[PDB]
């Protein structure tokens, strides 16, 4: 703690909203933000200390990522592969499932 987190989503607005929420969390910290699959690989290659990856459904990457890092992958939706699944926030629930994945 603080756990190093990476945001993966094609919309910059969504990445910033998640980054703003993690900024308020004392047990989690954002280390990388990526728009595409290839961008997510470049950021992951720069930081090996990444603990959790918050991946969006559509922008393949999950295949390459697991061979690079042991980090827990979590899906975001507005099933198979990732460890857990959280619904995209709307202006709390994410904080619970982020903590449960790191504890196990």
């Amino acid at each position: 703690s603080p756990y190093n987190v990476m945001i993966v989503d094609d919309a910059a607005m969504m990445r910033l909203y998640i980054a703003s929420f993690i900024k308020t969390l004392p047990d989690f910290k954002v280390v990388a933000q990526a728009a595409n699959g290839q961008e997510a690989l470049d950021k992951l290659a720069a930081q090996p200390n990444v603990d959790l990856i918050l991946l969006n459904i559509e922008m393949e990457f999950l295949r390459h990522a697991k061979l690079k890092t042991r980090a827990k992958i979590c899906m975001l939706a507005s099933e198979l592969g990732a460890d857990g699944v959280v619904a995209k926030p709307s202006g709390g629930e994410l904080a619970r499932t982020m903590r449960t994945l790191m504890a196990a």
Partner: protein
């Protein structure tokens, strides 16, 4: 919060410009196959950003567009001139909605977009 709304105005414009470009290309004389996907992603991005800031009215108007496009993509309904026409009117309505919500930093009343919601609902029922 100032950067979040600035990003909403930016991403919103980038998605709507792409939404308009695909519909205008279909109107010019291009196959649906190459344009059905690009605009679903454009509408899916715009609906997602509005849902995040709690712009319920903007999210609802974008959602019906997604359903009509979804009927073309998933259900296999032909994207006739009428589908393109309603979605082009939706593009201009959502453009006025995006510009208003960005300047006010709050949702729209949606009284002036009630005709479009029924226009979309009319076709969705007619296709189903």
């Amino acid at each position: 919060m100032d950067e979040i709304w600035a990003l909403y105005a930016d991403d919103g414009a980038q998605a709507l410009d792409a939404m308009e470009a695909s519909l205008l290309a279909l109107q010019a004389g291009e196959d649906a196959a190459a344009h059905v996907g690009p605009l679903f992603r454009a509408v899916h991005t715009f609906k997602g950003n509005s849902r995040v800031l709690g712009l319920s009215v903007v999210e609802s108007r974008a959602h019906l567009c997604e359903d009509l496009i979804g009927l073309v993509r998933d259900a296999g309904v032909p994207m006739d001139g009428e589908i393109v026409e309603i979605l082009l009117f939706a593009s201009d309505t959502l453009r006025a909605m995006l510009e208003e919500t960005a300047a006010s930093r709050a949702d729209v009343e949606g009284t002036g977009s009630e005709a479009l919601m029924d226009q979309l609902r009319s076709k969705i029922a007619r296709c189903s």
